[PDB]
Amino acid sequence: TMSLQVDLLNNTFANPFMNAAGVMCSTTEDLVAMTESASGSLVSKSCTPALREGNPTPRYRALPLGSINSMGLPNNGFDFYLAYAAEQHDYGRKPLFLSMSGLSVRENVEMCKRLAAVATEKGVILELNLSCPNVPGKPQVAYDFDAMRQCLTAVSEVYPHSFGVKMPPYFDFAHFDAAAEILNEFPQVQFITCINSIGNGLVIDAETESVVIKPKQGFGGLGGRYVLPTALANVNAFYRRCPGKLIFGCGGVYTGEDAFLHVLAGASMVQVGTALHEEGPAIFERLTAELLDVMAKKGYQTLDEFRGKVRTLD
Amino acid sequence: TMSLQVDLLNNTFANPFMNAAGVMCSTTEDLVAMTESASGSLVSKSCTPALREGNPTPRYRALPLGSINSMGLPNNGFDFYLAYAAEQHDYGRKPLFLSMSGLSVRENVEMCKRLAAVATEKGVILELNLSCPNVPGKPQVAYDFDAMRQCLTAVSEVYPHSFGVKMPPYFDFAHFDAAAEILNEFPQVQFITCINSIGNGLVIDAETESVVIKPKQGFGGLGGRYVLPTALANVNAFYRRCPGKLIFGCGGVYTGEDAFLHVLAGASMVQVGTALHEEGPAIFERLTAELLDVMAKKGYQTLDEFRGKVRTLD
Ligand SMILES: Cc1cc2nc3c(=O)[nH]c(=O)nc-3n(C[C@H](O)[C@H](O)[C@H](O)COP(=O)(O)O)c2cc1C
Ligand SMILES: Cc1cc2nc3c(=O)[nH]c(=O)nc-3n(C[C@H](O)[C@H](O)[C@H](O)COP(=O)(O)O)c2cc1C
Ligand SMILES: O=C(O)c1cc(=O)[nH]c(=O)[nH]1
Ligand SMILES: O=C(O)c1cc(=O)[nH]c(=O)[nH]1
Ligand SMILES: [Cl-]
Ligand SMILES: [Cl-]
Ligand SMILES: [Cl-]
Ligand SMILES: [Cl-]
Ligand SMILES: [Cl-]
Ligand SMILES: [Cl-]
Ligand SMILES: [Cl-]
C-alpha cells in the first residue's frame, strides 16, 4: 500500500502536485479547472495591484525541449485573486496558494496588508515571487541580495503568517550560500520554490532567421526539458542549506519519474509548468499514477521514505 | 561561390569552427588532432601555472540532451601549452588560441608576462577564462564585477596584445549591461566568448537514485543541447552592447544549422564542446559542409551577409 499524501503548512495534500504560477491559473475558469483537477493544490497567477494586459503577442512558444515566454505578468489584478481566495475557492477540495509579484516593495507591502486577513480567515498561502524575468526594466529581485532582504523585511513587518518565496535559479555555491543566509534569517519563510524559468534565453528559428517571441527582442524565460538539471540543483542546494524550511520543486516536470527526481532532491511539493501548458489539467491524473508506479517498482510506500535522499558518490 | 572565411585579429581563418577550451585539447595528441582536423582554429585547455590532476573521477557524463562535468581544471600546466604554442603548433595550417585560467589575478599576471613573448613571436592568441564553475571554493570571477575589473586591469597592464575573455552566462539585462560596461573599459579585450557552461546543474539518475558525477555532491556545469538558447542570448546581448568587439559563440552546437543560429546572433567564431567530445575531430568536416548547405539554401555567399542580422518581431 502506497500514499502520495503530503502534510505541511498545517494542511494535508492528497499528492504533491500543483501548477506553476503563471500556467493555467489566470481566469476564474482556469482556477476552477485546477481545483476540479486531481492536483494536490494550486497557485493563482502572479498578481500585481492593477490588472495587466501583459506583453505583446506572440509571447509564448512551445519547443521540442520545452518553452520560451515573455508574458510580462498578464493578470487580472490583486483584487480579483483576493476575491477568489476569500469567497470562491473550494477549500474543502484542496488548499490554495496565491502568487504575488508586486513591481515594488511598497506594492507587495500594500497587497500583503490586505491578504493577511484572508490568510487568517480562509487559509490561502502566500507565494511571494522574487524572480519574474519578463517585465521590461525590472531585474529579478532575488539577483540583488540587498533588495531581496529589503523586500522580505518589509513583508514580514506586515504579513504575520508563514509564506514562501519563488526563486530564480542560481548557478554557483557563493550565491546559493548568500541566498540561503538571507532566507534563514526569516523563520516565517517556510518554503522556497525552486525555480522560476531560466531567464532571458533567446530562441531563433533558422527558417525565418527570426526570434520566436515579440517582446524584448526575443529574449524570454526558458521552461521544460531545458531546465530540469538547473531546477534539481537549486532544489537540492536549498534543501541542504535551509534545513528549517520546505522546498517546492518547479522545472522540467513532464512525468512521475521527473517528479520522483524532484522529491529525491528534496522537494515537498512539485509544480508543473510547460507540460501543463501543453496538456491541460488532466495531466495531474497521469502524474499521480506515474509517480505511484515509480514508487511501486522501488518499494517505496510514502514520499517521506525518499525525500532528500538523492545519493552522492563523494 | 560561397566562403566560410573569417578575418579577424590579423589572421585569416578557413572557417569559423574551433573546439571549446575544455574539449579535445589537453594533450599533445589532442592538439595535433585538432590542428590536423578541418577546424578553422583551436584553443588549448584552460591552464594553471602548475599541472593539475583536477577533481576526483568520474567527473564527466554525456547525457541525451548534452553533458555535465565537474572537471576541476585538469591540465598539464602553463609551461606545456606555452611550449606547444612556441615550438610545436603548425601555424601554417591554422591560428592558435591559448586558454588561461589562473586561480588568482597574480597567477594570471605571472603567466601573461611569459605568454607575451610567444604571442609576439608566434602569434598565439589569449582567451582569458573568467568563468570556470568547477573549482571548489572558487566562484566564477565574471559573477563579481569588481573582481573582473581588477583582473582585466592587472592583465592589460602586463600583456601588450589584444586578447579575449571567456564569459559565464548571464540571465538578466542588468547583468548584461554591467558586464558589457566593464568589458568596454578595456580596449585590449577584442573578443568575448559566450558562453562557458551553465554552472552547477545537478543530474540525477532515477534508476540508481544517484547523482552522475563524483565531485561537489554531483553539481557540475551543463553543456550541449541544454544550453543553446542561453548561449544565443549571451552572444546576441554582448553583440549588441559591445559593438567595438568581436563575439565568439560557444554552446549547443551540433550541426551547421546550430552554427548558423550563432552567426545570426552575432558570432564571429563558433566553438564546439559537447558534440566534439562525443564525435571527435571529424565533426568539423560535417559542420562546415552543413553550414555551407544552409547558406546555399538561403542564397548567402559569405558569413558577413548575415552575421548579427537575427530578425526581431518588435
Ligand atoms: C506561460 C508562463 C507564465 C509564467 N508566469 C509566471 C508567473 O506568473 N509567476 C511565476 O512565479 N512563474 C511564472 N512562470 C514560471 C513558472 O512558474 C515555472 O517556474 C517555469 O515555467 C518552470 O517550470 P516548467 O519547466 O515546468 O515550465 C511562468 C511560466 C510560463 C511557461
Ligand atoms: C569536459 C569539459 C571541460 C571543460 N573545461 C573548460 C575549460 O577548461 N575552459 C573553458 O573555458 N571551458 C571549459 N568547458 C566549457 C566549454 O568550453 C563550453 O563553454 C561549454 O561546454 C558549452 O559548449 P557545448 O554546449 O558545445 O558543450 C569545458 C566543457 C567540458 C564539457
Ligand atoms: O508573466 C511573466 O512574464 C513571467 C513571470 C515569471 O515570474 N516567470 C516567467 O517566466 N514569466
Ligand atoms: O575543467 C573545468 O573545471 C571546467 C572549466 C570551465 O571553465 N568550465 C567547465 O564547465 N569546466
Ligand atoms: Cl502568445
Ligand atoms: Cl506555441
Ligand atoms: Cl474553486
Ligand atoms: Cl571521468
Ligand atoms: Cl600542431
Ligand atoms: Cl609554423
Ligand atoms: Cl557541442
Ligand nearest to the CA of B276: 11
Q: How far is CA A164 from CA A9, A182, B230, B239, in A?
A: 10, 13, 28, 38
For the residues of chain A, what is the DSSP string, one character each? -----EEETTEEESSSEEEPTTSS-SSHHHHHHHHHSS-S-EEEEEE-SS-B--SPSP-EEEETTEEEE-----B--HHHHHHIIIII--TTT--EEEEE--SSHHHHHHHHHHHHHHHHHH--EEEEE-----STT---GGGSHHHHHHHHHHHHHH--S-EEEEE----SHHHHHHHHHHHTT-TTEEEEEE---EEEEE-EETTTTEES-SGGGGEEEEEGGGGHHHHHHHHHHHHHH-TTSEEEEESS--SHHHHHHHHHHTEEEEEE-HHHHHH-TTHHHHHHHHHHHHHHHHT--SGGGTTT--B---
Question: Which candidate from B173, B203, B211 shows the least CB-CB separation from A200?
Answer: B173
> Same domain, yes or no, for B66 and B121?
no
> Same domain, yes or no, for B211 and B244?
no
Identify which of A226, A229, A195 has the alpha carbon closest to the alpha carbon of residue A62. Answer: A226
Query: Which value, to the nearest 10 degrees, does the dihedral of the CA atoms of residues B222, B226, B229, B233 take?
Result: -10
Between the two ends of chain A, the Cα-to-Cα distance in Å is: 34
Write the burial class of residue A188 (CB in 10 Å: 0-12 exposed, 13-18 middle, 19+ buried): middle
Distance CA(B140)–CA(B220), nearest Å, equals: 13
CB A241 within 8 A of CB A177: yes
C-alpha atoms less than 13 angstroms from C-alpha of B115 in its C-beta half-sphere = 32
Give phi and psi for B146, each to the nearest 5: -65, -45
Q: How far is CA A12 from CA A6, A9, A118, B20, B104, in A?
A: 6, 8, 19, 50, 52
Residue nearest (by alpha carbon) to ligand 1 atom 4: A22
Q: Which of the residues A25, A132, A151, A194 is marked catalytic?
A: A132
Residue B224 CB–ligand 2 contact under 6 Å = yes
Distance CA(A113)–CA(A108), nearest Å, equals: 8
CA A275, chain centre distance (Å): 14
Q: Is B65 within 8 Å of A225 when comparing Cβ atoms?
A: yes
Distance CA(B302)–CA(B309), nearest Å, equals: 13
Number of the ligand 3 atom closest to the C-alpha atom of A22: 1
Domain end point (choices A186, A208, A223): A223
CB A125 within 8 A of CB A9: yes
Q: How far is CA B37 from CA B15, B85, B273, in A?
A: 12, 17, 15
> Same domain, yes or no, for B84 and B217?
no
Residues contacting residue B234 through CB under 8 Å, at least 6 positions apart: B167, B169, B170, B176, B194, B195, B251
Q: Which DSSP letter does residue B276 get?
A: H
Q: Which DSSP letter does residue B203 get?
A: -
- For residue B190, what is its C-alpha cell? 577584442
Q: Which residues surround ligand 5, an ion (CB under 5 A)?
A: A 57-60
Q: Which DSSP letter does residue B266 get?
A: T
> Same domain, yes or no, for B167 and B38?
yes
Q: Which helix (H) or strand (E) holds B151?
A: helix B145-158
> Same domain, yes or no, for B40 and B171?
yes
Which CATH number fits the domain that encloses residue A213?
Answer: 2.30.26.10
Prior bond of A133 cis (ω within 30°)? no
For the residues of B37-51, what is the DSSP string, one character each? SS-S-EEEEEE-SS-
Give the SS3 label for residue B189: strand
- How many residues belong to chain B? 314
* Identity at A274, one-letter amino acid code: T
Gaps in chain A with C–N over 2.5 Å, residue before each:
none
CB B10 within 8 A of CB B34: no
Residue B192 CB–ligand 2 contact under 6 Å = no
CB B252 within 8 A of CB B228: yes
Active site residue A132: yes
Q: Which of the residues B25, B47, B132, B250 is marked catalytic?
A: B132
CA angle, A51 then A54 then A56, to 5°: 145
Residues contacting residue B243 through CB under 8 Å, at least 6 positions apart: none
Residue B290 Cα, ligand 2 centroid: separation in angstroms?
23
Q: How far is CA B207 from CA A294, A295, A310, in A?
A: 10, 11, 11
A213 contacts in chain B (CB < 8 Å): 313
Distance CA(B112)–CA(B39), nearest Å, equals: 26
Distance CA(A118)–CA(A106), nearest Å, equals: 19
Domain end point (choices B206, B223, B240): B223
Domain end point (choices B207, B223, B239): B223
Identify which of B270, B269, B266 has the alpha carbon closest to the alpha carbon of residue B243. Answer: B266
- For residue B51, what is its C-alpha cell? 599541472
Ligand nearest to the CA of A224: 1
Pairing of strands A6-8, A11-13: antiparallel
> Same domain, yes or no, for A170 and A208?
no
Identify which of A15, A37, A19, A38 has the alpha carbon closest to the alpha carbon of residue A303. Answer: A15
CB burial of A255-271 (b: ≥16 within 10 Å; e: otherwise) equals: bbbbbbbbbbbbbbbbb
Total tally of structural domains belonging to chain A: 2
CA angle, B273 then B279 then B284, to 5°: 75
Give phi and psi for B155, each to the nearest 5: -70, -45
CB pairs under 8 A between A and B: 167
> Same domain, yes or no, for B125 and B246?
yes
CA angle, B9 then B13 then B14, to 5°: 170
Pocket test for ligand 3, best of A60, A71, A108 (most atoms within 8 A of CB): A71
> Same domain, yes or no, for B207 and B286?
no
Nearest chain A residue to B295 by CA distance is: A206
Cβ count near A28 (within 10 Å): 12
Rounded to the nearest angstrom, the minimum Cα separation between A229 and chain B is 5
Which CATH number fits the domain that encloses residue A109?
Answer: 3.20.20.70
Residue B4 Cα, ligand 6 centroid: separation in angstroms?
34
Can you give the residue range of the structural domain that contains A213? 55-72+198-223
Number of the ligand 4 atom closest to the C-alpha atom of B70: 3
Q: Which DSSP letter does residue B15 get?
A: S
Pocket test for ligand 2, best of B25, B73, B196 (most atoms within 8 A of CB): B196
Number of the ligand 4 atom closest to the C-alpha atom of B135: 3
> Same domain, yes or no, for A209 and A239?
no
Q: Is A312 within 8 Å of B210 when comparing Cβ atoms?
A: yes
CB B219 within 8 A of CB B200: yes
- For residue B87, what is its C-alpha cell? 615550438
Q: Cα dihedral sign for B132, B138, B141, B143?
A: positive
**For chain A, what is the radius of gyration of the CA atoms?**
18
- For residue B303, what is its C-alpha cell? 558569413
For the residues of B54-116, what is the DSSP string, one character each? -SPSP-EEEETTEEEE-----BS-HHHHHHIIIII--TTT--EEEEE--SSHHHHHHHHHHHH
Pairing of strands A125-129, A267-272: unpaired
* Identity at B282, one-letter amino acid code: A
> Same domain, yes or no, for B60 and B49?
no
What is the layout of strands, in order, in the sheet containing B42-47?
A: B17-19, B267-272, B246-250, B189-194, B163-167, B125-129, B96-100, B42-47
Question: Which candidate from B68, B140, B225 shows the least CB-CB separation from A65?
Answer: B225
CA A50, chain centre distance (Å): 21
Distance CA(A244)–CA(A247), nearest Å, equals: 10
Cβ count near A215 (within 10 Å): 24
Distance CA(A236)–CA(A233), nearest Å, equals: 5
Residue appearing with cell numbers 604554442? B85
Distance CA(B111)–CA(A158), nearest Å, equals: 55
- For residue A278, what is its C-alpha cell? 501543453
Q: How was this structure determined?
A: X-ray
Identify which of B36, B32, B44, B39 has the alpha carbon closest to the alpha carbon of residue B78. Answer: B44
Number of the ligand 4 atom closest to the C-alpha atom of B73: 1
> Same domain, yes or no, for A218 and A249?
no
Distance CA(A275)–CA(A188), nearest Å, equals: 31
B237 contacts in chain A (CB < 8 Å): 200, 219
Identify which of A288, A279, A287 has the alpha carbon closest to the alpha carbon of residue A67. Answer: A279
> Same domain, yes or no, for A109 and A228?
yes
Distance CA(B130)–CA(B140), nearest Å, equals: 6
- For residue A94, what is its C-alpha cell? 484542496
Residue nearest (by alpha carbon) to ligand 3 atom 7: A132
CB A224 within 8 A of CB A275: yes
CB B142 within 8 A of CB B179: yes
Question: Which candidate from B65, B204, B237 shows the least CB-CB separation from A310?
Answer: B204
Ligand nearest to the CA of A67: 1
Distance CA(A250)–CA(A227), nearest Å, equals: 9
For the residues of B204-258, what is the DSSP string, one character each? EETTTTEESSSGGGGEEEEEGGGGHHHHHHHHHHHHHH-TTSEEEEESS--SHHH
CB A154 within 8 A of CB A95: no
Pairing of strands B267-272, B246-250: parallel
- How many residues belong to chain A? 314
Residues contacting residue B265 through CB under 8 Å, at least 6 positions apart: A202, A204, B232, B235, B236, B239, B247, B249, B308, B310
